[PDB]
Subunit: 384 residues, 3 copies
C-alpha cells in the first residue's frame, strides 16, 4: 500500500517541526531518497518551514508548508527550475503585510519556482468593494493546516506530499485547497493534483494562476517559449513592441522591467496542452502540461531585466489573466464553485535535460498547433 506520516495537523494542534525519513529505513536499495522538514531561523524567516525531497540521480524538490506549499526550487540533471530573487529568505507570512505598498506587500516574499496565486481572488491589486484586493491572493502566504507525506510500499516508491491551505472567513468564504505534489524517485518530472473545495453553503467565486518561474540555466539570450496557441496579445501598451518576438527571450536587459502576454492556448483532442521554455541550444528546458477545462488561459511573463533585478520568465496557466479582479469579473473569467463542490487542477512539470527531450516537447507542440495560424493581436484585451 503506502506509509503516511502526518507532519502537521491543526485539528489536533500538532506539528512535528524538524523531521526526516530516508529510503534506508524503509529498506529499499533502488533510487535512494530522503524527505526532510526543516524549521528555519533568522530575519523574516523565523519559524518558516521547508520540506524537501532529495532523490539520488533525480530531482531535489523544495517546498514551503509555511508559504502555502509553494515550490521554492527544483534541481537535478545539471539544471533547475527556479530563479534568483533579491528576496533570499523564506519569509514567514507573519512578517508580510499584503496591504502594504498599496496591495503589493506580496513582493516582499516573492522568490519561488511556483506560487499558487489564488484562490479567493488573484491578479494585480485594486481597491474595489471598498477594500484592497491584494496582489495574487492569499494561498501563497497561508501556512498549511494539514501536511502529510506518503511513500508507496511498492516500486517505484512514488512520494505524495499533501498540504491543506485554508481560506476560511466568517461571513465571507470557506475555500480550502488540498494541494498535492507527486514524484517518482529518479524521474525528471513531478505533478501537481490540487483540489479546491467550497466548504460553505453558498456558491463562491474563485480564481487561480499557477505562477511558474524559470531563470538560468534555461533562460538566456535566445531561449525560446514554446506553446500551441490560437491567439496572443500584449497585456498593456508597453508589451506591444515585444509581440512579434513573443517566442524569443532577450538576455539580461537594463530598463526592460517586464513584458506580459495573454494567450488563448490550443489543446489536443483530450483537452491537454503543453507550454515550455528551452535554452538557445535546445538541450535544456522545462515543460508544463495542463488541462484547458481546468485552466483555460495562459500568461507569459517575460521579466528579462538584470540578473540582480530578476532575470526570469513566468509560464502561468490559470483561470484568469493577471488583471485585477474587477476586470476578470467584467470579462467573465472568474469561476464559481457550488456549495460542497470541488475543482481539480492537474499539472505535470518536466525538467528537460537533453536535446531529444526538448525535441519531443517541440514535436508535440507542433502537432497540437497543426495548421492553426497563431493570431497575434496588438490590442490589449483590457486596460487596468
Amino acid at each position: 500500500g503506502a506509509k503516511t506520516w502526518v507532519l502537521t495537523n491543526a485539528e489536533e494542534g500538532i506539528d512535528k517541526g524538524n523531521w526526516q525519513i530516508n529510503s534506508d529505513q524503509l529498506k529499499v536499495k533502488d533510487h535512494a531518497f530522503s524527505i526532510e522538514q526543516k524549521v528555519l531561523h533568522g530575519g523574516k524567516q523565523e519559524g518558516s518551514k521547508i520540506l524537501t525531497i532529495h532523490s539520488k540521480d533525480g530531482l531535489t524538490i523544495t517546498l514551503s508548508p509555511t508559504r502555502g506549499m509553494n515550490l521554492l526550487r527544483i534541481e537535478g540533471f545539471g539544471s533547475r527550475m527556479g530563479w534568483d530573487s533579491p528576496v533570499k529568505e523564506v519569509v514567514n507570512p507573519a512578517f508580510i503585510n499584503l496591504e502594504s505598498r498599496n496591495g503589493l506587500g506580496w513582493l516582499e516574499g516573492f522568490n519561488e519556482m511556483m506560487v499558487r496565486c489564488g484562490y479567493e481572488w488573484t491578479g494585480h491589486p485594486v481597491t474595489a468593494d471598498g477594500q484592497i484586493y491584494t496582489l495574487h491572493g492569499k494561498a501563497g502566504n497561508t501556512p498549511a493546516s494539514l501536511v502529510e507525506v506518503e511513500v508507496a510500499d511498492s516500486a517505484p516508491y512514488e512520494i505524495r506530499i499533501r498540504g491543506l491551505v485554508k481560506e476560511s472567513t466568517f461571513k465571507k468564504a470557506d475555500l480550502q485547497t488540498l494541494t498535492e505534489l507527486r514524484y517518482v524517485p529518479g524521474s525528471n518530472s513531478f505533478s501537481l493534483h490540487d483540489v479546491l473545495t467550497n466548504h460553505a453553503d453558498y456558491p463562491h467565486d474563485y480564481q487561480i494562476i499557477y505562477h511558474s518561474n524559470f531563470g538560468t540555466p534555461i533562460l538566456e539570450e535566445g531561449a525560446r517559449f514554446l506553446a500551441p496557441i490560437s491567439s496572443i496579445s500584449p497585456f498593456n501598451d508597453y508589451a506591444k513592441s515585444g509581440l512579434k518576438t513573443w517566442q524569443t527571450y532577450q538576455g539580461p536587459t537594463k530598463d526592460f522591467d517586464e513584458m506580459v502576454f495573454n494567450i488563448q492556448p490550443l489543446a489536443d483532442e483530450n483537452h491537454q496542452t503543453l507550454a515550455a521554455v528551452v535554452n538557445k541550444a535546445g538541450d535544456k528546458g522545462a515543460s508544463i502540461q495542463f488541462d484547458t477545462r481546468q485552466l483555460p488561459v495562459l500568461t507569459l511573463w517575460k521579466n528579462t531585466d538584470t540578473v540582480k533585478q530578476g532575470y526570469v520568465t513566468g509560464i502561468e496557466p490559470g483561470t484568469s489573466y493577471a488583471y485585477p479582479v474587477t476586470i476578470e469579473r467584467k470579462q467573465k473569467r472568474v469561476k464559481q464553485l457550488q456549495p460542497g463542490a470541488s475543482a481539480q487542477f492537474d499539472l505535470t512539470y518536466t525538467l528537460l535535460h537533453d536535446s531529444a527531450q526538448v525535441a519531443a516537447v517541440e514535436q508535440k507542440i507542433a502537432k497540437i498547433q497543426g495548421d492553426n495560424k497563431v493570431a497575434e493581436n496588438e490590442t490589449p484585451i483590457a486596460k487596468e
Copy 2:
C-alpha cells in the same frame, strides 16, 4: 488562602508554555478537575495558546491567552455555550491583518463563545480622521501580558484565571484590562470580574461589548430570547421584519444573514439585569447577568443562517451598540475614563440544564419586567 501560578509575565520575559495542574496532585478531595495550558500548532494557529479548566462533573471552560483571554467554549451538563464557526483554528493574531477587507480582518479569527469587543473602541468598522477603526477593537486579538491561575486552598476550591490585556501606544493611549474568570468546581455558572484601568495622565475614551455567542443545542427553531426591557428597535431596515417576533428564533435559514436589535434593558434595584437564550422545550439555556451601570445597553444578534454559514445568537451587553465609533460618539454612548481611574465589568454566565432552572430565570426576568410595557420602536436609532 490560595495558591497562585504565574503562567505568563512579560515584565520578567517568561511564559511557561505547556503546563498543567490537577486536583489529584494538589490533594483536593471533592470535585475533580485539572487546569491545562497548551501551545497549539498548525496553520494560522502556530504558537497560539489555550487554557482550559477541565471538570469531571461541572463545566469545562476553554479560553485563549493569545486571543485576549476570549472564551472559546463552555461545555457541561449535556449542553454547551458556543457555536461552530467556519474558522476552526485558534488564529494567532500575528496572522490577522485587522485593517484588511476594509476593517473586517477580525472575521478571519471569529469563532469564540465570548469576545471582548473593545476597549479603545468597538463596533462595525469606519474610516474617520484618516484612520481605519477596525471591527470590534483590539482586545480580542491582543496576547495577554500577564496570566495567573489561582486555586483556593480549601473547599469549595474556587479557581480564578486572570489575564492582563494591554492597549498601550505612545502618544495615544495606555488602557489595560485585568480580565478575570472565576469558577467553583462542580458549578453550572462562572463569572467575569474584569477591571479596565486608564494608566495614562489624560482622560481617554473607551467602549466595550461582551459579545456572547450561543449556538446548538440551545439555539434551535422555537428557542426564545428572554430579557426585561423598556424598548427594542431594529438595527437597520432589514431587521424591521423581525421586530414583532424578537423573542423567538427561527431554525437554520438560507439567505437570512442576520437581524440585530438594539435594546434598553430594565434592571432590579441593585442595577442588575438578566438575559437568556433557552431552547424550545425550556429545559436548556444560558443566562447572563450584568450590571446596567457598567453595561447600560444590550444588543441581540440573531444570526439564524445555515449551520455551516453560522447558526448562532449573540447576547451582547455593552457600553455601546454595534454601530461604528462615529455614530456611538455622535449619540453620546462613548464613555470616558479619567487619568488613573478604573471601570469594572461584573457578569455571571449560567448554563441552565433543566426546566426548573430555566423557569427560575424566566420568573426573575418577569419580576424585573413587572408592569412596564415593552416599546417595540420601528425606527432604527442610527444609520451607518
Copy 3:
C-alpha cells in the same frame, strides 16, 4: 587575534537563541564583562530577542536583534541613556501593523534609546503615489538576518556587534544595512559604524534619522541642549513659542505634547560635530558625535510632557528632517545611493558622568561654534 560568534544567519537558517559568553571563559585580565542573548516571552514580546553587553564598572548596553538592532537602553556610572515609554514590551514586529492608525502603528512599539528611522524612507507618514509611507520606515521593525559578536583577545578587548537589517523587495528595492556597535570594556562611550549598501542594479532613494532618546536622570527642569549651529527653526507654528529657549528644557508639563526644532549644524576640520543633552547641575549628560557629510541635518525633539505620557528628548542626526517623504523629496534632502554603492554612518555616543566631562564637551563645542552667530528663524521650512 579575535573571536567571532555567529548568533543568527538566515542564509544558513540558524539562530542560537539563548546564548552567553563571559570574560572568565575568554581569560581577560583587568576588566570583567559578559555578552548574552535572551529570547523573551509574554504579551506582544513573544519570540523577541535582546542582546546585552554587561560591563562591570562600565556600560551595560542592551539592543534588540528582532527590532533592527535598535538600542533599548545604555546604563552605567549612576546614569543612563534611555527613557520610560508607556510601551513596556520589546514588541515583536509580527504584532505591529505599521499601516494602522493612518501610518502611526510604529507608535505601538516605540520605547527605545536609539531607533534607526530609515532606510528606504523616514519621517512622519503620508499617503503618496497610491501608497502609505509609514512613520519612520521599516529598519527599526525588521529582524536582523545576520548577527555576529566579535571580541578582541588582547587589551583593551574591544567588543563589536554586527547586525544585517535588510529592506529587500522584488521590483522595488534592495537596501541592506550592516549595522555595527563597538564598545571597549570599562569605557563611557560606544560607537556605531553602520554601512548601508544598495545591492540593486538601479539607483535608489534612501533616508535615515538616528533617533536617539534621553530621559531622566539627564532630562529635568533646566536641563540643557548643547550644539554648534548656524541656524535653528521650529517644525510648525506650535513650536514657535519655544524657539528663544531652544537650549533649555522645562519639567514634566501637562498639555505640552512636544516641540520639534530643525537645526543646521557646524563641524570641525574632519567634518565632525557634537550635540549633547546635559542636566541642570551640569554633572550628567550624553553626547553624540557624528559626521555632517553622512548626516547633514539635526532634529531636536523636546517631548517634555508628563512622566507617564513621555518625558523625553530626542537628539536626531540624519539625512532628513522628520517631515513626510513628499516634503523631503520636494526640498531636495532625499539621498540617492548608486548601484553597488555604500553609505557609512559613524557616530560616537558618550555617557558624561562628571562636571569636567560635561565641561570638555561644552568647550569642544565652543571651539566649533566660534564667532558664528546662531540664526533663529521663526518661519518653519515646511508645512505638512
